[PDB]
Design a protein around this motif. Structure first.
Motif, mmCIF file in Angstrom:
data_model
loop_
_atom_site.group_PDB
_atom_site.id
_atom_site.type_symbol
_atom_site.label_atom_id
_atom_site.label_comp_id
_atom_site.label_asym_id
_atom_site.label_seq_id
_atom_site.Cartn_x
_atom_site.Cartn_y
_atom_site.Cartn_z
ATOM 1 N N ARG A 168 0.829 -1.201 0.000
ATOM 2 C CA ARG A 168 0.000 0.000 0.000
ATOM 3 C C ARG A 168 0.863 1.250 0.000
ATOM 4 N NH1 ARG A 168 -5.533 0.095 1.410
ATOM 5 N NH2 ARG A 168 -6.447 -1.871 0.697
ATOM 6 N N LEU A 169 1.858 1.299 0.880
ATOM 7 C CA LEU A 169 2.964 2.243 0.760
ATOM 8 C C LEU A 169 3.953 1.731 -0.286
ATOM 9 C CD1 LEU A 169 3.379 2.780 4.554
ATOM 10 C CD2 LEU A 169 2.641 4.557 2.979
ATOM 11 N N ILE A 224 7.162 9.573 -11.696
ATOM 12 C CA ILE A 224 5.796 9.365 -12.155
ATOM 13 C C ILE A 224 5.716 9.440 -13.675
ATOM 14 C CG2 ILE A 224 3.486 10.273 -12.086
ATOM 15 C CD1 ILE A 224 4.266 11.290 -9.204
ATOM 16 N N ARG A 247 -3.436 3.347 -7.147
ATOM 17 C CA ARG A 247 -4.790 3.846 -6.937
ATOM 18 C C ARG A 247 -4.797 5.359 -6.762
ATOM 19 N NH1 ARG A 247 -6.483 -0.968 -2.666
ATOM 20 N NH2 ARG A 247 -6.285 -2.638 -4.205
ATOM 21 N N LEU A 248 -3.835 5.872 -5.998
ATOM 22 C CA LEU A 248 -3.670 7.305 -5.804
ATOM 23 C C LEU A 248 -3.517 8.019 -7.136
ATOM 24 C CD1 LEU A 248 -3.072 9.485 -3.589
ATOM 25 C CD2 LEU A 248 -0.731 8.877 -3.739
ATOM 26 N N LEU A 249 -2.667 7.486 -8.009
ATOM 27 C CA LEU A 249 -2.416 8.133 -9.282
ATOM 28 C C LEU A 249 -3.564 7.939 -10.258
ATOM 29 C CD1 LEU A 249 1.334 7.293 -9.657
ATOM 30 C CD2 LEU A 249 0.395 9.493 -9.114
ATOM 31 N N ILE A 288 -2.848 23.738 -0.196
ATOM 32 C CA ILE A 288 -3.197 22.341 0.049
ATOM 33 C C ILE A 288 -4.617 22.061 -0.427
ATOM 34 C CG2 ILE A 288 -3.627 20.656 1.863
ATOM 35 C CD1 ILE A 288 -1.235 22.109 3.358
ATOM 36 N N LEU A 325 -4.729 21.980 -4.258
ATOM 37 C CA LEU A 325 -4.302 20.673 -4.739
ATOM 38 C C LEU A 325 -5.382 19.629 -4.511
ATOM 39 C CD1 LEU A 325 -0.585 20.109 -3.699
ATOM 40 C CD2 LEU A 325 -1.404 20.711 -5.953
ATOM 41 N N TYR A 326 -6.094 19.718 -3.390
ATOM 42 C CA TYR A 326 -7.190 18.789 -3.136
ATOM 43 C C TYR A 326 -8.275 18.921 -4.198
ATOM 44 C CZ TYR A 326 -10.566 16.103 -0.427
ATOM 45 O OH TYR A 326 -11.474 15.164 -0.004
ATOM 46 N N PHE A 358 -6.841 17.479 -7.569
ATOM 47 C CA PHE A 358 -6.316 16.123 -7.639
ATOM 48 C C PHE A 358 -7.110 15.077 -6.864
ATOM 49 C CE2 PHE A 358 -2.617 18.746 -8.564
ATOM 50 C CZ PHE A 358 -2.039 18.076 -9.601
ATOM 51 N N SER A 359 -8.134 15.451 -6.104
ATOM 52 C CA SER A 359 -8.803 14.474 -5.247
ATOM 53 C C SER A 359 -9.755 13.574 -6.017
ATOM 54 C CB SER A 359 -9.569 15.163 -4.133
ATOM 55 O OG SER A 359 -10.234 14.207 -3.330
ATOM 56 N N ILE A 372 -0.414 28.435 2.994
ATOM 57 C CA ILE A 372 -0.119 27.005 2.864
ATOM 58 C C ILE A 372 -1.383 26.157 2.796
ATOM 59 C CG2 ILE A 372 0.929 25.052 4.037
ATOM 60 C CD1 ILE A 372 3.056 27.169 5.038
ATOM 61 N N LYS A 375 -6.765 7.977 -9.349
ATOM 62 C CA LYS A 375 -7.721 8.999 -8.944
ATOM 63 C C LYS A 375 -7.221 10.395 -9.288
ATOM 64 C CE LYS A 375 -10.656 6.092 -7.055
ATOM 65 N NZ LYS A 375 -11.818 5.680 -7.873
ATOM 66 N N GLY A 431 -1.046 1.152 -3.585
ATOM 67 C CA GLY A 431 -1.580 2.426 -3.154
ATOM 68 C C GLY A 431 -1.189 3.566 -4.067
ATOM 69 N N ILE A 432 0.057 3.570 -4.536
ATOM 70 C CA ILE A 432 0.483 4.588 -5.487
ATOM 71 C C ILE A 432 -0.320 4.474 -6.772
ATOM 72 C CG2 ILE A 432 2.392 5.267 -6.973
ATOM 73 C CD1 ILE A 432 4.155 4.501 -4.423
HETATM 74 C C1 LIG Z 1 2.993 23.421 1.708
HETATM 75 C C2 LIG Z 1 2.743 21.970 2.105
HETATM 76 C C3 LIG Z 1 2.574 21.114 0.855
HETATM 77 C C4 LIG Z 1 3.060 19.693 1.117
HETATM 78 C C5 LIG Z 1 2.223 18.700 0.318
HETATM 79 C C6 LIG Z 1 0.930 18.372 1.056
HETATM 80 C C7 LIG Z 1 0.199 17.245 0.339
HETATM 81 C C8 LIG Z 1 -1.258 17.617 0.091
HETATM 82 C C9 LIG Z 1 -1.892 16.520 -0.761
HETATM 83 C C10 LIG Z 1 -3.359 16.832 -1.054
HETATM 84 C C11 LIG Z 1 -3.672 17.076 -2.534
HETATM 85 C C12 LIG Z 1 -4.719 16.098 -3.069
HETATM 86 C C13 LIG Z 1 -4.106 14.745 -3.430
HETATM 87 C C14 LIG Z 1 -4.841 13.611 -2.731
HETATM 88 C C15 LIG Z 1 -4.618 12.319 -3.505
HETATM 89 C C16 LIG Z 1 -5.576 12.184 -4.687
HETATM 90 C C17 LIG Z 1 -6.460 10.927 -4.679
HETATM 91 C C18 LIG Z 1 -7.198 10.696 -3.368
HETATM 92 O O1 LIG Z 1 -8.162 11.329 -3.092
HETATM 93 O O2 LIG Z 1 -6.698 9.716 -2.506
HETATM 94 C C19 LIG Z 1 -7.512 8.589 -2.386
HETATM 95 C C20 LIG Z 1 -6.874 7.344 -3.009
HETATM 96 C C21 LIG Z 1 -7.992 6.307 -2.962
HETATM 97 O O3 LIG Z 1 -7.782 4.966 -3.277
HETATM 98 P P1 LIG Z 1 -9.182 4.100 -3.121
HETATM 99 O O4 LIG Z 1 -9.635 4.180 -1.683
HETATM 100 O O5 LIG Z 1 -8.956 2.656 -3.487
HETATM 101 O O6 LIG Z 1 -10.354 4.744 -4.095
HETATM 102 C C22 LIG Z 1 -11.516 5.338 -3.565
HETATM 103 C C23 LIG Z 1 -11.260 6.823 -3.311
HETATM 104 N N1 LIG Z 1 -12.477 7.602 -3.247
HETATM 105 O O7 LIG Z 1 -5.751 7.004 -2.265
HETATM 106 C C24 LIG Z 1 -5.099 5.838 -2.647
HETATM 107 O O8 LIG Z 1 -5.061 5.512 -3.783
HETATM 108 C C25 LIG Z 1 -4.452 4.989 -1.569
HETATM 109 C C26 LIG Z 1 -3.307 5.781 -0.962
HETATM 110 C C27 LIG Z 1 -2.356 4.841 -0.243
HETATM 111 C C28 LIG Z 1 -1.151 5.628 0.253
HETATM 112 C C29 LIG Z 1 -0.096 5.781 -0.834
HETATM 113 C C30 LIG Z 1 1.030 6.658 -0.307
HETATM 114 C C31 LIG Z 1 2.141 6.779 -1.342
HETATM 115 C C32 LIG Z 1 3.137 7.867 -0.934
HETATM 116 C C33 LIG Z 1 3.985 8.321 -2.125
HETATM 117 C C34 LIG Z 1 3.226 9.354 -2.963
HETATM 118 C C35 LIG Z 1 3.967 9.648 -4.268
HETATM 119 C C36 LIG Z 1 3.018 10.124 -5.368
HETATM 120 C C37 LIG Z 1 2.605 11.584 -5.184
HETATM 121 C C38 LIG Z 1 1.467 11.913 -6.148
HETATM 122 C C39 LIG Z 1 1.191 13.414 -6.161
HETATM 123 C C40 LIG Z 1 -0.298 13.699 -6.372
HETATM 124 C C41 LIG Z 1 -0.572 15.188 -6.164
#
Ligand SMILES: CCCCCCCCCCCCCCCCCC(=O)OC[C@H](COP(=O)(O)OCCN)OC(=O)CCCCCCCCCCCCCCCCC
Ligand SMILES: CCCCCCCCCCCCCCCCCC(=O)OC[C@H](COP(=O)([O-])OCC(O)COP(=O)([O-])OC[C@@H](COC(=O)CCCCCCCCCCCCCCCCC)OC(=O)CCCCCCCCCCCCCCCCC)OC(=O)CCCCCCCCCCCCCCCCC
Ligand SMILES: CCCCCCCCCCCCCCCCCC(=O)OC[C@H](COP(=O)(O)OCCN)OC(=O)CCCCCCCCCCCCCCCCC
Ligand SMILES: CCCCCCCCCCCC(=O)OC[C@H](COP(=O)(O)OCC[N+](C)(C)C)OC(=O)CCCCCCCCCCC
Ligand SMILES: CCCCCCCCCCCC(=O)OC[C@H](COP(=O)(O)OCC[N+](C)(C)C)OC(=O)CCCCCCCCCCC
Lengths: 61, 81, 49, 185, 168, 68, 89, 469, 128
Positions: free
Chosen positions: B12-13, H408, B20-22, B73, B76-77, B80-81, B69, B24, B17-18
């Motif tokens: 998942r980490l 990515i 699914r995250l990507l 955030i 970005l939500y 990208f959410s 900040i 979405k 998880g990456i």
């Molecule tokens: C000044 C301060 C700034 C610092 C930065 C702060 C960060 C703010 C981030 C918020 C911005 C919005 C981005 C949120 C992620 C987008 C997708 C999401 O909403 O996450 C859910 C996703 C869901 O997966 P699932 O549950 O299966 O599907 C149903 C979801 N309704 O989730 C998943 O798929 C499961 C997640 C499992 C955990 C994976 C962790 C991986 C960590 C490495 C990440 C590298 C990739 C970065 C991608 C960047 C995207 C912007």
């Protein structure tokens, strides 16, 4: 050459009633389809149903 | 261990998880310019929103930084959410 | 064995002459995943004739 | 009698706001083009007011005389459907319209001053209170006007931009022929 | 008519390792100080471009079979090649004037030419139809213009005194 | 290229302040460039008339409230 | 300064929030250029400077060429489609 | 030489048929080659970074701009070769790739605008050149007027570029209102720290940058690149970017901007994420160009950025040309021609290319792993120099974002290679038609440059240290 | 109040004099067919535009650049003495570059109207 106009039909005398049947039915179809155009072009004070009634009357004659 | 850590949380980490995250985040990024009916008005609105949002953000950061900040955030939500 | 997969493992369509049809116009998918051409030789055979 | 002609800049500003609103609002786009022509007339007036009637006449002969003519030329020849200004279609824009109006106007008035504190940057833009003294000198011996000086600098100090505008006008000829005409072989 | 400068210029500036002759040489001087190597470059380009299109036709032909290009294309090719070569030759001679390449011959020739001009009571770098202000504007437009040979051509035709040399 | 030219073909309204400032820049290096602060202030004052406007605001306010 | 900023901002908003026409888009672009030129010329007068008027006449020329090219592109779009609709550019 | 070329080609094309445009393109390609060969000795003017002001003070000539001009000539040579030489002498490839009559003239005028952007020293020249670029590239998008998609893109591009040009003009005239000048040489230490001037300058930077797709204003240009012909996309996705980013790098306008940092992070994240679900090739490559534009935005915050920018823009140009050429070469083996204009659209149409042409897939692999930044290839050294500069200048969060975006983006770069090295039924066994010699040589040369250019890095640095320091 | 200003305002705010005289003096009692438009003539809901030749719009699109050329020559004729023998050469180069485009326009025959129903010029050959 001297070409025909928009909706011209070359004069061709059928040698059968069954072919002229289809020709007449097609002409009836065309009149009915064109009745809205007859009401728009000629500033007609009555219905499109009335125009089609008249067409049917003249085809029944 | 083998199933909940090594094939669970550490995937998942990791690759799952990456993925699914990507998925979405990509779907949210491309389903932003929503309407193909008119491509011009939409992107025009995007110019307007970008200029307005930037101006207000620069106002906010001149007032004080740390307040901008969470605004970024949340942006970005929304993107990208 | 073949079903087309994408970069992230997701489902991709196999694009044929199948869905350059009048059925699959007037649908509201994003610009990326539309698959209706509008310049296909299937659709544009009678164009300014 | 003196100050009957004082507010003739403010009147042009008011009329410009009105003509822009009518451009956005007109049902038929022909009327929008006519209101654009009226806005060009208002701008030409204002340019006469501040002392640039040469630019007023240049505007009348270029913008109204060619560009507006071409606009009318195309809408006379092309089918340009239109949706009328509606409350079921455009009222959704009011929040963003108002936010953007306020933000964009205030930033456009703040951007011109160099003061550090942000509120004072608008307050200097509205500081149009004190009149300019126009004294007379006797050093200019020639009859040089604005057009003469434009020619002088454009043909000597800035000859390169003229000889690049030549290629811009070449594009203006060569592009439309490539796009509109179909070459046989 | 006075042929005296309005603005200050560098004296003996170093654009390279070799000494300076003229920082904005006239077209006449740049063409008269050319070497046989420069004319060889001209002929080389003039011959290389048409041969180039024939070589291209040999490698990949337009139609299926090889056919020597029309004399139309060879004519236009020769003209464009001569233009490219004149550009390169003008640039080589101008860089010899600037001190970027070896310019001993051109230095001695300029010395002798200026000495003869002083002997004949003539102004160095010529007398102009233009006012001093337009001489200045022309120099500022034409000075170091050969750097933009890739984009546009520009040449000195004005006989100004703003060549970067001592007063006499 | 067309810098310092008027609408009439000559020197502009704020030429002299600009020319003084540019003389002082030619004298100076990037570390001694802060000597040219008053000259640049003068150039900008000629351009925009901020300080004179504030001065006249003070004069007018003394004509305004200390009388009525 | 005021008339130009006002014309510019209102033209930009009438470009952005246009759900009606393409002609309005053309008009709003031209009026935006007009507003810029008016601010430019007011500053030209106040500074007693020619660079502003030079830039202004250059903008006149460039905007004319822009209009010509834009209305050639519209004509190509209309060659193929035959009707320029409320939406779809 | 360009203006000579334009004034010559206008006449020669007016007095010539449509059967002669390919040969005209060949002629002017050889012309550009001869120019780049014979006139390139002018680099000696810029020894020890000697800089020259030309046409009054309207143009600037230094080693940076000479290099960008040589690069733009090289790019125009390749893009003209793609139009002047038939891939295959079939009826299909005489239907897909035909030059239109005015296309070469518009290309040369756009190149002129590009170079007058990079060489600009006064904002009047910049604006005239920006418009000469943008009008010409509108018309280039529109010249294939028998395409609905291309006409639509023409008009969108006209309006959006028009608005961003309004922004540039507002920035310029506001700068003039403040300082009474059109020249950035008018700025120094004192003027920067005495006047607050960042709104105007960043407005200019963004008006220039949104014209190359900087987020959040990327979707329109990506649609334009998708909807245009492939041989037009290859040009309109590269040369404007080079021109504008080179101007913004030579002009030190955004040295520690927070807005440019924020928008560059956004460009990286968008250009990496949004390309993951793209099924089409040109949109994928557009998002690739977007993230590379982000990498190059990062070095607008440095004040010593010449080496990194020049290396990265050269390697990105070579990689871009190579990948578009590989997609152009792959059309002989795809099983379904989509359009007369975009014969290949979807990535899964490249499935099984290794069984029809394996060395084309070797080229694709080299280019894909240069995009990913894998050593010893060229993109690795690009990314390395960028990272060196940004970490020497104190951008530590942007560096981690850069690594994450590099990772990515590799997924959608590898999508192509993965589907290309997959197995396919109905392979090719024989074909009597052979692809062109010239275009094959050009592609092979680009691939060999990507692969073996690291040998000369020492020499390049030693030359840079004499001509740029 | 100058005579120029008086005239240029007076002409518009008086031009409706005979308009009002005609509106008040003249009859107005319309018919349907007096509100009509022609001897014969009609058109169904077919379209709002007719197909036009390219030259009709190209003449207008090309009026803009040539008009801008001739208007850009105005600074020269008002600066002709001050730009003595330098601006002369510059404007000659300007005119030559802009004559190249005119040459292109002529050689393409862009303002020519082409005819569809050609006259047949092919021989009459009889297969024996
Ligand atoms: C000044 C301060 C700034 C610092 C930065 C702060 C960060 C703010 C981030 C918020 C911005 C919005 C981005 C949120 C992620 C987008 C997708 C999401 O909403 O996450 C859910 C996703 C869901 O997966 P699932 O549950 O299966 O599907 C149903 C979801 N309704 O989730 C998943 O798929 C499961 C997640 C499992 C955990 C994976 C962790 C991986 C960590 C490495 C990440 C590298 C990739 C970065 C991608 C960047 C995207 C912007
Ligand atoms: C070929 C020329 C051959 C030649 O040597 O003729 C010399 C001849 C002078 O002969 P001369 O009697 O011995 O006088 C010697 C000095 O030159 C006389 O010095 P002078 O002070 O008396 O000069 C007065 C005036 C005398 O000039 C004249 O009035 C003659 C008029 C000639 C008209 C054109 C023919 O000269 C000028 O001011 C000319 C200004 C030149 C402007 C810059 C032109 C260079 C650019 C050319 C390329 C095009 C630009 C594209 C760039 C696009 C930008 C993106 O000058 C010219 O031919 C000028 C030609 C310019 C054409 C370009
Ligand atoms: C082109 C289409 C035509 C329409 C054009 C419309 C008019 C144009 C408006 C201006 C030009 C657009 C500018 C685009 C936005 C981006 C501007 C920018 O990024 O510059 C910000 C810059 C500081 O950023 P930076 O230099 O990078 O960081 C170092 C900080 N020391 O510089 C600054 O610090 C900025 C100074 C801060 C003040 C900003 C003013 C905003 C005030 C709004 C208040 C409104 C009232 C409250 C809310 C009302 C809502 C009801
Ligand atoms: C920890 C590193 C890691 O976990 O990175 C491993 C993953 C591998 O992803 P994948 O599942 O194999 O991609 C699916 C591809 N298919 C479907 C073609 C097989 O890299 C990534 O997704 C992006 C790396 C983000 C870096 C943070
Ligand atoms: C120049 C044509 C570019 C077209 C693309 C081809 C690349 C040519 C690279 C030569 C650059 C040079 O040798 O120069 C080094 C330049 C500055 O030197 P310069 O002022 O330009 O002098 C050069 C004089 N020439 C024109 C006569 C040669 O430093 C740089 O940052 C170059 C960074 C580019 C890195 C890419 C390396 C590619 C591998 C090369 C394998 C032979």
């Amino acid at each position: 050459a001297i070409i025909a106009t928009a909706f011209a039909e070359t004069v061709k005398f059928s040698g059968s009633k069954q072919e002229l049947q289809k020709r007449t039915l097609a002409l009836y179809r065309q009149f009915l389809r064109g009745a809205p155009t007859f009401a728009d072009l000629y500033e007609v004070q009555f219905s499109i149903p009335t125009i089609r009634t008249k067409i049917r009357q003249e085809f029944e004659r | 261990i083998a199933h909940h850590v090594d094939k669970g949380s550490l995937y998942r980490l990791g690759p799952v998880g990456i993925n699914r995250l990507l998925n979405k985040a990509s779907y949210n990024v491309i389903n932003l310019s929503s309407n193909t009916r008119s491509s011009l008005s939409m992107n025009s609105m995007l110019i307007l929103i970008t200029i307005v949002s930037l101006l207000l953000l620069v106002l906010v950061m001149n007032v004080n930084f740390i307040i901008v900040i969470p605004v970024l955030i949340s942006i970005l939500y929304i993107l990208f959410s | 064995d073949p079903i087309p997969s994408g970069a992230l493992g997701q489902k991709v369509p196999h694009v044929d002459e199948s869905h350059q049809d009048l059925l699959f116009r007037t649908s509201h998918m994003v610009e990326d995943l539309e698959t209706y051409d509008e310049d296909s030789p299937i659709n544009t055979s009678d164009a300014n004739t | 009698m003196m100050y009957l002609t004082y507010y003739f800049i403010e009147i042009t500003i008011f009329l410009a706001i009105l003509c822009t609103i009518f451009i956005i609002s007109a049902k038929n786009p022909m009327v929008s083009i006519l209101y654009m022509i009226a806005l060009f007339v208002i701008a030409a007036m204002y340019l006469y007011l501040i002392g640039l009637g040469i630019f007023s006449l240049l505007y009348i002969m270029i913008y109204i005389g060619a560009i507006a003519v071409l606009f009318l030329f195309i809408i006379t020849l092309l089918d340009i459907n239109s949706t009328e200004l509606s409350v079921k279609s455009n009222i959704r824009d009011l929040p963003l319209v108002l936010i953007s109006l306020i933000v964009l106007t205030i930033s456009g008035l703040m951007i011109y001053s160099n003061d550090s504190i942000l509120i004072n940057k608008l307050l200097e833009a509205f500081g149009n209170d004190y009149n300019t003294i126009i004294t007379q000198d006797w050093f200019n011996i020639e009859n040089t006007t604005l057009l003469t000086t434009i020619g002088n600098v454009l043909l000597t100090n800035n000859a390169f931009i003229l000889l690049v505008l030549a290629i811009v006008l070449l594009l203006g000829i060569i592009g439309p022929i490539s796009i509109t005409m179909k070459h046989k072989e | 008519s006075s042929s005296t400068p309005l603005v200050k210029t560098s004296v003996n500036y170093s654009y390279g390792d070799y000494p300076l002759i003229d920082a904005d040489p006239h077209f006449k001087r740049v063409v008269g100080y050319m070497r046989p190597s420069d004319y060889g470059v001209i002929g080389l380009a003039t011959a290389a471009l048409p041969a180039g299109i024939c070589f291209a036709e040999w490698l990949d032909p337009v139609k299926g079979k090889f056919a020597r290009p029309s004399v139309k294309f060879l004519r236009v090719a020769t003209m464009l090649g001569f233009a490219v070569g004149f550009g390169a030759a003008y640039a080589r001679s101008s860089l010899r004037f600037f001190g970027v390449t070896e310019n001993a011959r051109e230095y001695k020739k300029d010395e002798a030419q200026m000495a003869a001009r002083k002997a004949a009571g003539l102004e160095p770098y010529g007398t102009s139809s233009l006012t001093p202000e337009l001489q200045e504007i022309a120099a500022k437009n034409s000075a170091h213009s050969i750097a933009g040979l890739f984009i546009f051509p520009w040449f000195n035709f004005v006989n100004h005194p703003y060549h970067g040399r001592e007063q006499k | 290229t067309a810098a310092g030219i008027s609408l009439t073909g000559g020197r502009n309204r704020c030429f002299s302040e600009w020319q003084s400032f540019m003389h002082c820049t030619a004298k100076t290096d990037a570390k001694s460039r802060a000597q040219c602060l008053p000259n640049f202030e003068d150039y900008m004052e000629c351009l925009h008339h901020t300080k004179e406007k504030a001065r006249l605001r003070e004069i007018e306010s003394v004509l305004k409230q200390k009388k009525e | 300064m005021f008339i130009g900023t006002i014309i510019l901002v209102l033209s930009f908003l009438g470009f952005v929030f246009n759900r009606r026409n393409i002609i309005l888009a053309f008009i709003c672009l031209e009026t935006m250029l007009l507003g810029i030129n008016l601010i430019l010329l007011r500053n030209s007068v106040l500074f007693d400077d020619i660079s502003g008027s030079l830039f202004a006449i250059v903008i006149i020329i460039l905007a004319g060429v822009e209009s010509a090219i834009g209305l050639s592109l519209l004509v190509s779009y209309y060659r193929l489609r035959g009707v320029i609709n409320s939406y779809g550019i | 030489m360009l203006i000579l070329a334009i004034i010559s080609l206008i006449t020669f094309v007016s007095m010539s048929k449509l059967s002669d445009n390919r040969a005209i393109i060949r002629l002017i390609n050889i012309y550009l080659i001869l120019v780049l060969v014979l006139d390139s000795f002018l680099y000696l003017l810029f020894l020890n970074n000697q800089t020259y002001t030309v046409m009054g003070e309207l143009l600037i000539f230094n080693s940076f701009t000479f290099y960008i001009d040589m690069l733009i000539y090289f790019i125009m040579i390749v893009i003209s070769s793609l139009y002047g030489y038939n891939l295959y002498n079939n009826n299909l490839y005489k239907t897909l790739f035909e030059p239109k009559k005015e296309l070469i003239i518009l290309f040369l005028i756009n190149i002129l605008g590009a170079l007058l952007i990079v060489h600009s020293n006064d904002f009047i020249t910049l604006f005239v050149a920006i418009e000469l670029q943008s009008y010409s590239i509108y018309l280039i998008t529109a010249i294939y007027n028998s395409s609905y998609k291309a006409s639509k893109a023409s008009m969108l591009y006209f309006f959006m570029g028009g608005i961003l040009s309004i922004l540039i003009a507002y920035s310029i005239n506001t700068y003039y209102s403040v300082l009474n000048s059109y020249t950035l040489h008018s700025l120094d230490s004192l003027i920067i720290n005495t006047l607050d001037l960042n709104l105007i300058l960043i407005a200019l930077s963004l008006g220039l940058l949104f014209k190359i797709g900087i987020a959040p204003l990327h979707k329109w240009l990506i649609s334009i690149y998708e909807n245009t012909p492939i041989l037009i996309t290859i040009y309109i996705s590269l040369i404007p970017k080079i021109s504008i980013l080179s101007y913004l790098v030579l002009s030190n306008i955004s040295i520690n901007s927070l807005v440019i940092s924020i928008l560059a992070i956004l460009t990286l994240l968008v250009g990496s994420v949004g390309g993951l679900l793209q099924i089409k090739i040109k949109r994928l490559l557009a998002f690739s160009g977007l993230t590379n534009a982000g990498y190059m935005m990062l070095l607008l915050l440095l004040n010593n950025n010449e080496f990194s920018y020049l290396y990265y823009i050269t390697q990105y140009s070579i990689s871009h040309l190579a990948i578009f050429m590989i997609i152009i070469f792959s059309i002989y083996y795809i099983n379904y021609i989509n359009n007369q204009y975009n014969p290949i659209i979807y990535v899964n149409q490249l499935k099984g290319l290794i069984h029809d042409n394996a060395y084309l897939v070797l080229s694709m692999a080299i280019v894909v792993f240069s995009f990913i930044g894998i050593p010893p290839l060229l993109g690795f050294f690009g990314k390395l120099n960028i990272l060196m500069s940004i970490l020497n200048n104190g951008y530590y969060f942007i560096s981690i974002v850069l690594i994450v975006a590099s990772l990515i983006s590799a997924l959608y770069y590898l999508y192509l290679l993965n589907v290309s090295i997959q197995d396919k039924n109905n392979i090719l066994i024989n074909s009597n038609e052979t692809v062109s010699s010239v275009l094959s040589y050009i592609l092979s040369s680009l691939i060999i440059l990507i692969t073996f250019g690291f040998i000369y890095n020492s020499l390049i640095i030693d030359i840079f240290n004499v001509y740029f320091n | 109040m100058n005579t120029f200003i008086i005239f240029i305002i007076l002409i518009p705010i008086v031009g409706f004099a005979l308009l009002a005289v005609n509106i008040l003096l003249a009859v107005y009692k319309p018919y349907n067919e007096k509100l009509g438009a022609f001897e014969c003539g009609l058109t169904s809901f077919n379209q709002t535009r007719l197909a036009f030749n390219a030259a009709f719009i190209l003449v207008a699109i090309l009026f803009l650049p040539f008009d801008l050329e001739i208007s850009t020559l105005l600074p020269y004729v008002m600066s002709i003495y001050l730009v003595s023998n330098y601006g002369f050469t510059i404007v000659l180069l300007f005119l030559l570059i802009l004559i190249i485009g005119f040459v292109y326009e002529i050689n393409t025959n862009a303002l020519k109207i082409n005819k569809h129903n050609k006259p047949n010029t092919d021989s009459l050959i009889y297969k024996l």
